[PDB]
Amino acid sequence: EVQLVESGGGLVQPGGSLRLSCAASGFNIKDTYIHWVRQAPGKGLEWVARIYPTNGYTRYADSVKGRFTISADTSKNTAYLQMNSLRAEDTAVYYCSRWGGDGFYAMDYWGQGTLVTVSSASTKGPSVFPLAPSSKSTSGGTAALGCLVKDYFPEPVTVSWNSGALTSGVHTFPAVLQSSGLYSLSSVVTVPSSSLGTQTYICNVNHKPSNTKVDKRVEPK
Amino acid sequence: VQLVESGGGLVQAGDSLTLSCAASGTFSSVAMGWFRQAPGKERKFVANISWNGDSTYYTDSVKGRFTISRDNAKNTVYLQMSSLKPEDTAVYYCAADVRWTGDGHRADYWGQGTQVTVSSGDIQMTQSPSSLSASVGDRVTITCRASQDVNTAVAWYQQKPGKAPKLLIYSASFLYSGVPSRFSGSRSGTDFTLTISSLQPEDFATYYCQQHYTTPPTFGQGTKVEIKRTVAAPSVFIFPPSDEQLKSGTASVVCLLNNFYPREAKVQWKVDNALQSGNSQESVTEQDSKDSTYSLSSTLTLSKADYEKHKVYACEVTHQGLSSPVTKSFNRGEC
């Protein structure tokens, strides 16, 4: 089965350069067109560029013309998006997708996305504190608990619970921009009252931009 | 349900044969298509016709020569073949609910085959509405107008929070493999509609139409579809600062408002009965793909010192699902 995996997003200084990788598995990139499509935060979808990896014939959106370069390496079955002359309007999640079909084209398979933040500011790993389950955080057999992920830049942080064994009743809130200019978000989970004390609760925070991986253990009050 | 093909024969190169497929079981809501197969070699796709006939598409080797028609009243799908080459010599199969897969085509129903022997001797997509909200099992429609003719080079994509856009409809009216039958696409010149017939709590998303008729392929405004549910009150919980956070000079106090509907809730902080302002930050989650609820976190951020000044730290919540305001609190220093 066809799979497009991306790598190389994150923080990049204005004016600077960032090269995104799109690794393809389950097909040859020589058979189809590979694309890059972006999405500004809370905005719609923008087609960036495209390549026909066979001959290397590219096509770009005026918005990225002369600045970004789409290129492929068939030997590796990977397509690339080298971003140069980086402006703030370029801050977006960057997806790659292919055009698959028989007697038609359609972006059937996409990449997972990678957020690119164009900022002069510096990277900062988060500070994780437990939001410990209390009797003031219990209501009719359902106990809530969580994790505070304060002071990090840029986005994103990803929170998983018990290494992904716990997914039900999880709510990792969107991040809030503080006065500092740093982001902070919570991630909460509601578990049964019987489970506290007998079951271990750990939140797995990952700030890829500054390679931070923290596994804070949430114990009761 | 059975599909029965009729019309195959021996033909000389450059002749013209029509194949009929009688579907008995209804068929008018699904895509009908034709496959072909040469013995010893895997079965390959030929042509497809969307449920309403809006759009068709043909494998490159038959484009311009073959024509797929459909009679919804006569329960028939036809294949008008023309200028037949000897390489068209195969067993022609007729199929029901033919959909692209990413590796080829799939179908729900298959015919028995009829042998055929050929003997040698800048465009903008204007989406409407931008926001939409409806109850479960309501029929919703997203109308998207092309600036100039784009034929049927139009695809419908659903995007949910956090994740990448997913392909729902292709070639204006064709369903991709996996997509539930409640979604149907339609074309009328430049106007392309998407119809989710029996709206579900997992259809919460932003949908975009897209034209790939020219370069650049262009997307529409999108449509955030909100799923309505019954008024549901929040479960309010209160979280004091950890001792870890207090070692530094700050104290964050989070108030959780779990799983509520509608999204409008009001949260007031009180510190020793003293109502707080401009010292708290809010964040609301995106509606649930399962129960259509929202959740909200109000964080009260103060200094280590100020937290040590006061006693009671209360969170006061107001919502439709409540007859009265919910207050959750704690006293600093008590177990």
Author numbering:
A (entry chain H): 1 to 221
B (entry chain L): 2 to 26, 28 to 123, 155 to 368
Lines from the paper:
We investigated the importance of difference parameters by engineering masked antibodies based on the well-characterized therapeutic antibody trastuzumab (Herceptin), which was used as a model. Three antibody fragments with affinity for trastuzumab were selected as anti-idiotypic masks, based on two single-chain variable fragments (scFv40 and scFv69) and one nanobody (dAb), previously developed and characterized by the Navarro-Teulon group.
CDR H1, CDR H2, CDR L1 and CDR L3 of trastuzumab are not involved in the interaction. The co-ordinates were used to calculate the buried surface area of the trastuzumab-dAb interface using PISA,41 which was 405.8 Å2 and the complex (without the linker) was predicted to be stable in solution. The measured affinities of the masks for trastuzumab were 540 ± 10 nM for scFv40, 56.5 ± 0.03 nM for scFv69 and 0.192 ± 0.003 nM for dAb, which are lower (scFv40 and scFv69) or similar (dAb) to the affinity of HER2 for trastuzumab (KD = 0.071 ± 0.001 nM). dAb has the highest affinity for trastuzumab and also shows the least binding to HER2. In this case, dAb has a very slow dissociation rate (koff = (5.76 ± 0.08) x 10−5 s−1, Figure 2e), and therefore it comes off very rarely (half-life of dissociation is 3.3 hours), which does not provide many opportunities for HER2 to bind, especially over the time course of the incubation with SK-BR-3 cells. For T-dAb, cleavage of the linker between the antibody and the mask by TEV protease did not result in the activation of the antibody.
